[PDB]
Amino acid sequence: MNKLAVLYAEHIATLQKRTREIIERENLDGVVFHSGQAKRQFLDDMYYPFKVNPQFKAWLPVIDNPHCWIVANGTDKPKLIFYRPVDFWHKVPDEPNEYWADYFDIELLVKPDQVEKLLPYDKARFAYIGEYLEVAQALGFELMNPEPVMNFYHYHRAYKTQYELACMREANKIAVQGHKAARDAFFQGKSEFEIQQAYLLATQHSENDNPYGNIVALNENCAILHYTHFDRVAPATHRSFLIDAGANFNGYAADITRTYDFTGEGEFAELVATMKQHQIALMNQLAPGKLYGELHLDCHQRVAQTLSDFNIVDLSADEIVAKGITSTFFPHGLGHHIGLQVHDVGGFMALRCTRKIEANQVFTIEPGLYFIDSLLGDLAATDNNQHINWDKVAELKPFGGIRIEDNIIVHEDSLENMTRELRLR
Amino acid sequence: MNKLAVLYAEHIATLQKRTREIIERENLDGVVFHSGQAKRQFLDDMYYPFKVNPQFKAWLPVIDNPHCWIVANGTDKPKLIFYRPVDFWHKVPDEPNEYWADYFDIELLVKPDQVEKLLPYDKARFAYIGEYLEVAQALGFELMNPEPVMNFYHYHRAYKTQYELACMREANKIAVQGHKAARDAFFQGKSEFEIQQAYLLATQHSENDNPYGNIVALNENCAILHYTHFDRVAPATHRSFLIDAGANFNGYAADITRTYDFTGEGEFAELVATMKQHQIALMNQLAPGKLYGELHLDCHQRVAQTLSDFNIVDLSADEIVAKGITSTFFPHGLGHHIGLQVHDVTRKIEANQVFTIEPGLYFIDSLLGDLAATDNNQHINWDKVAELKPFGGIRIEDNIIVHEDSLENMTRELRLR
Amino acid sequence: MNKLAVLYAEHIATLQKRTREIIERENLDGVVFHSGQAKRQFLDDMYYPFKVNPQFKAWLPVIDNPHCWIVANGTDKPKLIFYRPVDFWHKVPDEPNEYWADYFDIELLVKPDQVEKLLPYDKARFAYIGEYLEVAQALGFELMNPEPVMNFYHYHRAYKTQYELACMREANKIAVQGHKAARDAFFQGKSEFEIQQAYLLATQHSENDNPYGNIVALNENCAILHYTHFDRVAPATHRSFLIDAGANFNGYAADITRTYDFTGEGEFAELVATMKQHQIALMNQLAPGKLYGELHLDCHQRVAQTLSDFNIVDLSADEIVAKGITSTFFPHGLGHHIGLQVHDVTRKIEANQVFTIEPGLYFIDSLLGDLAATDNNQHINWDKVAELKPFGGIRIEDNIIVHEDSLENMTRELRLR
Ligand SMILES: CC(C)NP(=O)(O)NC(C)C
Ligand SMILES: CC(C)NP(=O)(O)NC(C)C
Ligand SMILES: CC(C)NP(=O)(O)NC(C)C
Ligand SMILES: [Mn+2]
Ligand SMILES: [Mn+2]
Ligand SMILES: [Mn+2]
Ligand SMILES: [Mn+2]
Ligand SMILES: [Mn+2]
Ligand SMILES: [Mn+2]
Ligand SMILES: [Mn+2]
Ligand SMILES: [Mn+2]
Ligand SMILES: [Mn+2]
Ligand SMILES: [Mn+2]
Ligand SMILES: [Mn+2]
Secondary structure, three states: OOHHHHHHHHHHHHHHHHHHHHHHHOOOOEEEEEOOOOOEOOOOOOEOOOOOOHHHHOOOOOOOOOOOEEEEOOOOOOEEEEEOOOOOOOOOOOOOOOOOHHHOEEEEEOOHHHHHHHOOOOHHHEEEEOOOHHHHHHHOOOEEOOHHHHHHHHHHHOOOOHHHHHHHHHHHHHHHHHHHHHHHHHHOOOOHHHHHHHHHHHHOOOHHHOOOOOEEEEHHHHHOOOOOOOOOOOOOOOOEEEEEEOOEEOOEEOOEEEEEEOOOOOHHHHHHHHHHHHHHHHHOOOOOOOEHHHHHHHHHHHHHHHHHHOOOEOOOHHHHHHOOOHHHOOOOOOOOEOOOOOOOOOOOOOOOOOOEOOOOEEEEEOOEEEOOHHHHHHHHOOOOOOOEOHHHHHHHHHHOEEEOEEEEEEOOOOEEEHHHHOOOO | OOHHHHHHHHHHHHHHHHHHHHHHHOOOOEEEEEOOOOOEOOOOOOEOOOOOOHHHHOOOOOOOOOOOEEEEOOOOOOEEEEEOOOOOOOOOOOOOOOHHHHHOEEEEEOOHHHHOOOOOOOHHHEEEEOOOHHHHHOOOOOEEOOHHHHHHHHHHOOOOOHHHHHHHHHHHHHHHHHHHHHHHHHHOOOOHHHHHHHHHHHHOOOHHHOOOOOEEEEHHHHHOOOOOOOOOOOOOOOOEEEEEEOOEEOOEEOOEEEEEEOOOOOHHHHHHHHHHHHHHHHHOOOOOOOEHHHHHHHHHHHHHHHHHHOOOEOOOHHHHHHOOOHHHOOOOOOOOEOOOOOOOOOOEOOOOEEEEEOOEEEOOHHHHHHHHOOOHHHHEOHHHHHHHHHHOEEEOEEEEEEOOOOEEEHHHHOOOO | OOOHHHHHHHHHHHHHHHHHHHHHHHOOOEEEEEOOOOOEOOOOOOEOOOOOOHHHHOOOOOOOOOOOEEEEOOOOOOEEEEEOOOOOOOOOOOOOOOHHHOOOEEEEEOOHHHHHHHOOOOOOOEEEEOOOHHHHHHHOOOEEOOHHHHHHHHHHHOOOOHHHHHHHHHHHHHHHHHHHHHHHHHHOOOOHHHHHHHHHHHHOOOHHHOOOOOEEEEHHHHHOOOOOOOOOOOOOOOOEEEEEEOOEEOOEEOOEEEEEEOOOOOHHHHHHHHHHHHHHHHHOOOOOOOEHHHHHHHHHHHHHHHHHHOOOEOOOHHHHHHOOHHHHOOOOOOOOEOOOOOOOOOOEOOOOEEEOOOOEEEOOHHHHHHHOOOOOOOOEOHHHHHHHHHHOEEEOEOOEEEOOOOEEEHHHHOOOO
8 A cells, every 4th residue: 555645545634624614714615725836037938946835735745836726615525726738848747646636626727827717616705825816816816815714724734644744754864865975975075066966966856856945064154054155166174064954755844954073073073962962952852732932941051051061151051041142152043843834834823932842743953053253243242252262262163053953743642853763863 | 504503413412521521520320400490579470580500501502491401421312301381371382393402302391390200210329400409309319519510511611612602603793783783872872771772672682681781881880890770861961982781692692892982082082092902902912821810911011001101190001010000990800701601610721712801991989089098199190080080981892712723803803893 | 231331432442543543653563462471480380470461451451361462453353362271270260241341352262372373474563562572572573562662552551541540440449448447457556467457358459469569667667668568566656657558440550648646646646737738738739731840849848848847957948948958858759640550651740640649758767867967967956856756757648630620639539538
């Protein structure tokens, strides 16, 4: 059989159920999900890569097809207007024939402007869920992405079905295959660009195939949080390596990060090691009922406990915390839900210190320690400048920073660290 | 077909399951729910209006019928003993033939005394849930409203089934109709008595149909938190109007309050608009996991803020809260659960619970006098107090359903400004 | 009709469900539970008393039978290999014809070795849960107590099913009978040994039947937390008495502790009454969501308050908790989970869980001596310890079921004070 296919059946049933609750709560005849269209480059004839509407790939693993429409009410079989053009120019895939095809009443669409006769006769009562408000309005839809319907699905999107969890496991598997190849490459001393190419080859992913734009940084670039470029020339000296990169599976994202030392023995190599442990401990705290805010205060606690131990700051943890200086070394959140979207949706009425970690939710735990001169500077401009070992900073500054991020499934009974279980030390 | 009908199924199921968990926990063979009886007036042949046992209508929408009995163990089908006299004096109704009828095994009772026959022969382990202790004892029951069972059912009453929420929506619907007609009557310059008549006609409710005695206050009566009368004569001039009033549907209540300024302008009209903002802002703080306490505090802050911004108290918000002055302008709670009973049976907000959000701001003598004797007296703009005094007070209250994902303000979704 | 009979259905259903949910997650075709075997005494022909596999009885109440196996997946009716040998030397029980029988496909085993014939043909994706590894491997199994499967059931074992709650109620009932008989034996000045025999006779339990090894202590013995021996000879003088004993029902256990003062007046008697308070006060801070750690810290608080009130210590409750001396008069936990195992398999108290709130205050030389070698020696009222030491200590343990709507102290609801 197909473990995935057996899971899918329940996935559909879950979405169907949520579709019924919501159109009732808002008195709708049904919800229409538009996959989107391709965007044309200004004054050109080229297009940007296509990126499906999350709300559409939520139902099925069709992420590379524009002009597809889902119309459902939760009780009847959902309709799938599937775009399958015909023209010798582009290769034509066979009609939908995989396990999910059976769960929809599929109607083939050959021309994007022919969709109206395939849609409901009276559209006034169906909610349009998509980006092209103009096109919907032309077809007769009047309810444009109703906040109530959007927040509803978004709220439940935080609770991953079994098919979703399996999908995400697959995405993690592919992503580590590449996080290791990218590792080897760093140690072989290749450039950021070469390593990035290594990661793509190992994940069999094209650049536009991955969930977000990879961060492949070396030495001081590791401090650029949102580093996007890829130097083509390998640094003179290879010191530090930080790579934030994921992979995709049926529309679900993986979001892993790893920092490395080139040798594996100096101060920095030591710093990373602390972080790893800190990271794993923060990972170990996830449990239904916990408030993210607690793991937050604890991450910052551990940061300060690290800044004090490596004499980066000549104070104690409680004071680095208290005086409020841990944020200039760890300037971002500890984690975020993740699924169909890297920084996934959810939460009571459209990550907070108040939100509660619940079962079947997926998270990233990504604590970090960075030496970001811009942020480092503003610290020297306050009467805290005194309490810091600047000589120590410049001693590490050339390594940029550290980040370790895993993707963890939270079960009612336990934690499943997809990343580490796949053995990515 | 019938939306209420479908949801009812799950209602019964829920109640049946709630019942099982409890007769097992307390080792009972079943629970008996007595609709109640009609109270005769002293020395007279007249009676009081009938008021069904809450514990009884929790199961079905039969609220105008005395001498009715429900006996269930949560496992077997629930047993309904249905009072139904026969005679020419009173109009007799067609047998129970509505959606709910099928979920019970109905036994027609033609006379109150002719009931013991239909009840369980060995009422040893059956608990009697009702007001009529003696009547029960003489029948054979011994367990009288056994506390653990009452607190049990009452705990779970805070968690409404879908059926219940649908009933509540319908009651808010009716109640808003009335609230609109009431507002109209006010502006037409009618009297409290007349505004009240208007309300009853729009809601198609008789006075004894209200889930509670309406409050129809005009001008300074708006400061009487429990104003009971309806003046037959109208005010010389019309300034303010406060109406707290709801309605009923299948035993569920709506509890809605709205305040209005007659001219729509002046300081009071703006104070009501300020209040309306706070009310909505409070309603918007509701969310599963949260402590009502939190909302209570913020409400007092909102009052503190308003008191300062309008120059009622010459102190900053924090100054007004710190000195506990707010409580003399807003003496009651912020809200309560609502359901089968208007005031339904630290505490954390949770899904499927229905609350009222009723911030208020009033100018009450008793309390302003008590304030004048606390020395805070030399901190409040007694001129501004006297200026607004003639308006009485303000209160705005909605009924909100709290879903796991969002809020459903029944009252405002009905477009009752 | 019957009692447990009904609740059992839902018991099976639930374990079935939990099994489905786990075989799939671990990619297993099924799980096999081994009741166990009777261990033979070295070089002899006598055996140890049989002690069933918790994981095995977790399904049905067959705790005295070795060579029994359960094979399930969560979807198919569960498979039961019931060991039932035949021969004139032993009495032969009828075939399993009790309510729990029908929930299984029952295959009788007459000799152990003959088990391979009834077990899964391909044992590749079957997890063996038992302690007899070599026998498993020799049978074909390879998956021996896979950790993620063990941690699964155990996690859920913390949530009892109605049936399981019934069974535990019965256990508490029986235990309380024995706890009252034991109580009287104490006042009648009997020896530890006699008191125990009194407990056993009242609870109708043979020594090996009780959940754990009963602790029956008198005087200074009370300070020995794990007192295992029973004095055959009564104490010269009768001061104090601590008894930690429980019972067994269908595999479920009771674990109650009561401390007494012979005279019923005097420092100790007082100190005991107070402890009783703190125990009831704590038993009341039990509620879904409560953080054990908060209870545990509040207990140590009351302990420090008693150490200060009875002036055992010369410091304020807080300074006592401050210098952490409290850990020398209360060296053990505040409670634990209980169910199929006495010590059942930062944490929050959920509903449908069962806890043993068991606070205590003891005069252990072993620790007082350690404490006297610290600057705290400076604060301790030694002249007071010598006045209590002769009584050993105290411990009041109850078994409470946490429901979502309320709390249920089984022990106390049974009348044991
Ligand atoms: C770019 C983004 C996907 N990486 P991240 O959100 O996991 N961590 C940030 C803070 C760099
Ligand atoms: C009379 C009662 C139903 N109104 P209320 O409880 O909503 N507000 C009170 C505080 C005046
Ligand atoms: C022997 C054991 C079952 N008793 P307990 O664990 O409840 N208390 C300890 C401190 C003796
Ligand atoms: Mn079709
Ligand atoms: Mn950016
Ligand atoms: Mn990342
Ligand atoms: Mn991330
Ligand atoms: Mn009870
Ligand atoms: Mn009153
Ligand atoms: Mn009201
Ligand atoms: Mn109210
Ligand atoms: Mn021991
Ligand atoms: Mn014990
Ligand atoms: Mn114990």
